[PDB]
Amino acid sequence: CDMEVSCPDGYTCCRLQSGAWGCC
């Protein structure tokens, strides 16, 4: 989802409660 943080496992892009742009 992100340039630095890649989601090769095959996770979907979503918003984290903490307030960050990650994939769950």
Method: NMR
Whole-number Cα distances in Å, 18 to 4, 5, 8, 22: 18, 16, 22, 11
Buried (b) or exposed (e) across 10-23, using 16+ Cβ within 10 A?
eeeeeeeeeeeeee
Q: Where does the chain have alpha helices with state H?
A: none
What CA–CA distance (Å, rounded) separates 5 from 13? Answer: 11
Judge whether 8 and 2 are in contact, CB under 8 Å: no
